[PDB]
């Protein structure tokens, strides 16, 4: 088996910038035939199945841009991207085409840095379908800040709650390089109803002070 | 326009078997060279193995030879995947693809979740998320399905600028997930929101008209 192996693992670039990836095949992709080296770089970005960037080291498929260049020969490749874009935010791969089994490298994924950004956070009330079922859940979405790192709290009539907390992140925004989380609770239809005030409480780097959004279940 | 089209998760019970098919579409299957490829949760790409429609002759990965068998049906111009004795190991997204020469562009299919489990499938409850009492933004609650994926979009594709889905979370066996949807607010309740959501593992599917509380 050729061994298809890639570096670094993920590199932190900046809108702008100009990248560069290697790939190194433990045997040799050259075709001394054909005079191809065989290696192909895919991009996957999240949630999407692998798009192709490049056959044979350099030839780049239908639509590709040309930001994307393969350069390389024999057992060392490297990809390079000038001028990367918010889009350009994913996991790239190499492959062996040469000889079977066709084995693929193990990944660069590419994550972006920027400017600070405070999150933008909403409620929900628990809904009407859901009472009805006598199950209630409150959600609170903090979206688009940068970084990542945030804390949200609940507080029930004022204290504190974890017991039965989802929380979840989305990746960074292939549009504003910004991340999303949701925090959402469950409660009992019981519980519900014992109290009336919530609060969703985040905290951010951004701010000095938490943000709070809050509702009354009358209302 | 050309594209490659794929089965639909599933839900298959250690021991057993399945077969995951990929069709083309607006082309035929004669003309390309179809691969299989596995992707792992959080884990990276593997190619499992090749055909060739033109004699049926395939060739894999050795390591999956004896679990993986691809064939072809060249007059529906369907591939199809036979994974046997099934595992754990055996749960991911399971894609195919192949090279086009006219269109110089390799077609990727959608991916075919499986999903290698005794438990039972159990479709969402999905929720509307109206505000409490410039822009104002709206979500949707799906909650304890099982097992994944669930494709949540809202107008059916229209609205999808500022929409945000959140990754699935267990807690219980049963995952649950939410997206909201951020608008101008003119829109708003003038012009109506509809959260659909269906999914693939127990075929059933979901429209839910955010109104105002």
């Known amino acids: 088996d050729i061994v298809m192996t890639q570096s670094p693992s993920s590199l932190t670039v900046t809108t702008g910038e100009k990248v560069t990836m290697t790939c190194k095949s433990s045997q040799s992709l050259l075709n001394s035939r054909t005079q191809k080296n065989y290696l192909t770089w895919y991009q996957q970005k999240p949630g999407q199945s692998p798009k192709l960037l490049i056959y044979?080291?350099?030839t780049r498929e239908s639509g590709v841009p040309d930001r994307f260049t393969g350069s390389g020969s024999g057992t060392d490749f490297t990809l390079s991207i000038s001028g990367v874009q918010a889009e350009d935010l994913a996991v790239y791969y190499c492959?062996?085409?040469?000889?079977?089994?066709?084995?693929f490298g193990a990944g660069t994924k590419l994550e972006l840095k920027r400017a600070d950004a405070a999150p933008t956070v909403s409620i929900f009330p628990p809904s009407s379908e859901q009472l009805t079922s006598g199950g209630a859940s409150v959600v609170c979405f903090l979206n688009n800040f940068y970084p990542k790192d945030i804390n949200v709290k609940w507080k029930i009539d004022g204290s504190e709650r974890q017991n039965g907390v989802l929380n979840s992140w989305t990746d960074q925004d292939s549009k504003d390089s910004t991340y999303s989380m949701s925090s959402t609770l469950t409660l009992t239809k019981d519980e519900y109803e014992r109290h009336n005030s919530y609060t969703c409480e985040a905290t951010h780097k951004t701010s000095t002070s938490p943000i709070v959004k809050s509702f009354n279940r009358n209302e | 326009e050309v594209q490659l089209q794929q089965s639909g998760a599933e839900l298959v019970r250690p021991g057993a078997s399945v077969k995951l098919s990929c069709t083309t579409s607006?082309?035929?299957?004669?003309?390309?060279?179809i691969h299989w490829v596995k992707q792992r949760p959080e884990q990276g790409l593997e190619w499992i193995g090749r055909?060739?429609?033109?004699?049926?002759?395939?060739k894999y990965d050795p390591k999956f030879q004896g679990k993986a068998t691809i064939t072809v049906d060249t007059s529906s111009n369907t591939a199809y995947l036979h994974l046997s004795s099934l595992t754990s190991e055996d749960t991911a997204v399971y894609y195919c693809?192949?090279?086009?020469?006219?269109?110089?562009?390799?077609?990727w299919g959608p991916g075919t979740s499986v999903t290698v489990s005794s438990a039972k499938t159990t479709a969402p409850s999905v929720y509307p998320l109206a505000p409490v009492c410039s822009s104002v933004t709206l979500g949707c609650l799906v909650k304890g399905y099982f097992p994944e994926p669930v494709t949540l979009t809202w107008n059916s594709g229209s609205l999808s600028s500022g929409v945000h889905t959140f990754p699935a979370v267990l807690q219980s066996d049963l995952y649950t997930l939410s997206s909201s949807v951020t608008v101008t607010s003119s829109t708003w309740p003038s012009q109506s929101i509809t959260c659909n959501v269906a999914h693939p593992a127990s075929s059933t599917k979901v429209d839910k008209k955010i109104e105002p509380r």
């Open positions: 492959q062996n085409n040469y000889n079977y089994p066709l084995t």
């Open positions: 044979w080291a350099s």
């Open positions: 693809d192949g090279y086009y020469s006219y269109y110089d562009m390799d077609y």
């Open positions: 055909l060739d429609p033109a004699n049926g002759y395939t």
């Open positions: 607006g082309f035929n299957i004669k003309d390309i060279y």
